[PDB]
Amino acid sequence: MRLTNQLQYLQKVVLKDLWKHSFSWPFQRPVDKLQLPDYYTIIKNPMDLNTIKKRLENKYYAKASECIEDFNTMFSNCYLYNKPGDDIVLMAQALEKLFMQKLSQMPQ
């Protein structure tokens, strides 16, 4: 179709941009007038931006590709266990477009 640089771009640029986006709150913990069904929709995804942020702070990833797998896990779980029209899905989709744009610009 260098490891420190990749991981540093993922932390300081990619994650930063998602973290600060206005739709990232369903993908963060804690969740801060939310209805209870919607609270469950958010928290039933076992991957979130917090987990990725901590792994990046604590040198958890041996490869940048392992970081990308966590991101995939997060988006994938959203799409799998919610319906295509759902708010959480459309929000995940906008974050995912931002993620893929920024990933595309990562130095190679």
Side-chain angles (χ1 to χ4, degrees), residues 1 5-7 9-11 13-19 21-30 34-53 55-58 60-82 84-107:
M1 272 152 81
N5 286 343
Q6 289 184 303
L7 287 174
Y9 181 89
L10 280 190
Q11 183 174 63
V13 168
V14 183
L15 188 52
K16 173 193 73 82
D17 279 338
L18 272 59
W19 194 254
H21 187 283
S22 67
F23 291 168
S24 58
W25 62 272
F27 309 101
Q28 289 170 335
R29 307 292 184 276
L34 193 63
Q35 290 198 63
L36 289 189
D38 287 341
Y39 189 64
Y40 185 66
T41 297
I42 294 164
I43 68 160
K44 74 187 198 189
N45 193 343
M47 185 55 65
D48 53 55
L49 293 180
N50 299 80
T51 299
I52 297 160
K53 180 167 107 40
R55 289 186 174 173
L56 286 167
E57 287 161 351
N58 295 338
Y60 172 88
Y61 298 117
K63 299 166 72 176
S65 65
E66 294 161 16
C67 190
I68 301 300
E69 283 147 33
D70 280 352
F71 276 106
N72 187 54
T73 296
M74 188 184 80
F75 292 122
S76 284
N77 287 343
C78 190
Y79 303 153
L80 184 50
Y81 295 114
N82 301 290
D86 296 357
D87 289 353
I88 197 180
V89 172
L90 302 171
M91 296 171 92
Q93 287 178 319
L95 287 169
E96 193 191 3
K97 295 175 208 105
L98 176 59
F99 174 73
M100 299 184 283
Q101 286 160 11
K102 292 307 171 157
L103 196 49
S104 266
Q105 299 166 3
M106 180 191 272

